[PDB]
Amino acid sequence: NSVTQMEGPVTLSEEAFLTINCTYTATGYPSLFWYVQYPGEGLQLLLKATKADDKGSNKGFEATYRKETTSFHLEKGSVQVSDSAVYFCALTPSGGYQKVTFGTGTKLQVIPNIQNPDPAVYQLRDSKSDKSVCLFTDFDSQTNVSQSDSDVYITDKCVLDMRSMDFKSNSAVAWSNKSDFACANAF
Amino acid sequence: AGVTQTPKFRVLKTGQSMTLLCAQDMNHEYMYWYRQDPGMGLRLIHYSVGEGTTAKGEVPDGYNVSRLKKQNFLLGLESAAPSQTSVYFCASSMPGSYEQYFGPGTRLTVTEDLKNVFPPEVAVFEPSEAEISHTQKATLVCLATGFYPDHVELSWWVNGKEVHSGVCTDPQPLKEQPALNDSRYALSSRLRVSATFWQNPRNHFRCQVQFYGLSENDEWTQDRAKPVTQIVSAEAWGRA
C-alpha cells in the first residue's frame, strides 16, 4: 500500500480555489482519509470516505473517493488564512484493525488580500531601553521580504488578524547591535 | 483529543537515556509512536495492537517501546544521539470511528553539553508615533533572544488576560549564529491594537516567553543559575 500526494508548499491567496491531489495504490477496498496539522499542533482527522464514490466534507473542504482513478483529491472552493496547515492524505484497510499509510503531507500557506497596501518601515524603541528594532508592515502579500550578514537579523513575514476592525496585515521585524544601523535600509 | 504526552519538551545530552510516555483513557486498543522531521513527513517508529504487544514501524532503530497497560504506550531512548532531535507524536485508535487521535507532540533536542542550555532574554518595543499618526493603529513588538534549545511558547497578556486576536509570532525561531552548531535562537512576536487602546495609561501589555529547560533531576555544575523551566516576561503600560 502507498499514498502519493502533491509535494512542496502550496501558496494561495485568500478566497482562491484549493485542490490537493492524492493518488493511492491499494490491495483491496481501503478506507481513505485527510488529516490536518495546524501549526504547533498534532494531526486531527479532517475528513474521510469508507467506500468508493463516498464524499467526506468538513470545514468547507471535500474529497471524493474515486475508485476508477484510485484518488482522493482534497478541494475547497474558498480558502481562508485560518486554513494554513499541513494536509495529510491517508489510507488503512477496512475496519481499522491495521496501521495507517500516510502521504508525505502538503504544506498550505494562505496569504491575505490586502485591500489598501501601504508599505511602511517604522522604528520602535525599547520601553526599558538604548535598544531598537525596525518594523516593516502593511505591504501586500506578493511582497517578498529579503533575508539579511550575521549582525543584522530579519524575520520572515507573518500575518496578523485585527478582527476588531476586520483587518489583516503582513509584517516583518529587523534588529541589529551595530551603531550604524538605520531602519530606512533594513528592508 | 484525549491523548496526552509527557514530557511536552525535553533537552538531553548525547548518550543519555529518556522515556516518552503517552496516555489515553478512551480504551483504544491501538497505540502508535511517530516522529516528524522537515521533508520526511510523519514516520512510524513502533506501534502496539494491544496490552503487552509491540511491533516495528518504518524507523525503529535507536528506540525501544513498552505497552505495560492498555492506557499507556512508552517510548524509550537508551543512548540519545543528535539524529534523534525531532517532534514526536503519539496516537491511538479503536478498531471495530477508527481514525487515529493524536497527542500534542514532544519536542526533543539532543545536545553535546548541557552547558549550552540558556533561557531567553525578553524585551518589548513600544509602538512608533509615525505608525499611530498615519494608521490610528499601534504595533508592539516582543523580542526573545539568546535561548537554547528552541523550546519556547510566546504569548501576549493584556490586562492579565491572554490575547490571541491581533497577534502574530514567527513560525520558526531564527539562528543567532547560522554557521555554528549549538547556536542560540531569537523569536519575535507582534501585537497590534488601536491607537486609542495603546494611548490609555490604564491598559497593561505583557509579552510572556515560557521556556522549557533542565529538569530537577539534571546535574548542574556551572557558574550561573540552572536553566530550568521558567517564564521570562517584558511589559509596558499604555502611554497617552
Q: Both A11 and A89 in a single domain?
A: yes
**A19, A44: one domain:** yes
Q: How far apart are CA A37 and CA B110, in angstroms?
A: 25
Assess contact for A175 and A153: CB atoms under 8 A.
yes
Are A158 and B128 a contacting pair at CB < 8 A?
A: no
CB contact (8 A) between residue A173 and residue B188: yes
Q: Are residues A98 and A148 in the same domain?
A: no
Grid cell of B222 as nine digits: 556551572
Q: Are residues A123 and A107 part of one domain? A: no
**Domains located in chain B, CATH noted:** 1-112 (2.60.40.10), 113-238 (2.60.40.10)
- A187 in the same domain as A117: yes
Q: What DSSP letter does each residue of A18-79 carry, written as one string?
A: EEE-EEEE-SS--EEEEEEE-TTS--EEEEEESSTT-EEEETTEEEE-BTTTTB--EEESS-
Report the domain count for chain A.
2
Cell output for A10: 502550496
DSSP A59: T
- Judged by DSSP in three states, A81 sits in helix
Residue where a domain terminates, one of A94, A111, A128: A111
Shortest CA gap A122–chain B (Å) = 6
- Backbone φ and ψ for B63, nearest 5 degrees, come out as -130, 150
Other beta carbons less than 10 A from residue B30's beta carbon = 22
DSSP string, B49-62: EETTEEEE-S--TT
The verdict on A59 and A133 lying in the same domain is no
DSSP state of A141: T
Find, in chain B, the residue whose alpha carbon is nearest to that of A102: B42
Of A79, A111, A143, the residue at which a domain comes to its end is A111
- Whether residue A96 contacts residue B91, with contact meaning beta carbons closer than 8 Å, is answered with no
Place of cell 468547507: A60
Phi-psi region of B131 (alpha: psi -120 to 50; beta: other; left: phi over 0): alpha
CA dist A112 → A134, A139, A161, B148, B190 (Å): 22, 11, 10, 33, 17
Cis before B149 (ω within 30): yes
- Among A4, A6, A116, A127, most B C-beta atoms within 10 A, so best to mutate, is A127
3-state DSSP assignment of residue A113: coil
Resolution limit in angstroms? 2.0
Integer-rounded Cα Rg, in Å, for chain B is 21
Q: Could you say which DSSP state residue B199 is in?
A: T
B contacts of A127 (beta carbons < 8 Å)? 123-126, 234-236
Query: A116 and A105 share a domain?
Result: no
Q: What CATH number is given to the structural domain containing A52?
A: 2.60.40.10
Supply A124's cell numbers.
Answer: 520602535
Single out the residue of B17, B160, B6 nearest to residue B74, CA to CA.
Answer: B6
C-alpha cell at B56: 516495528
Range of the domain at A145: 112-187
In a shared domain, residues A80 and A127: no
Residues of chain A in contact with residue B166, where contact means CB-CB under 8 angstroms, are 160-164
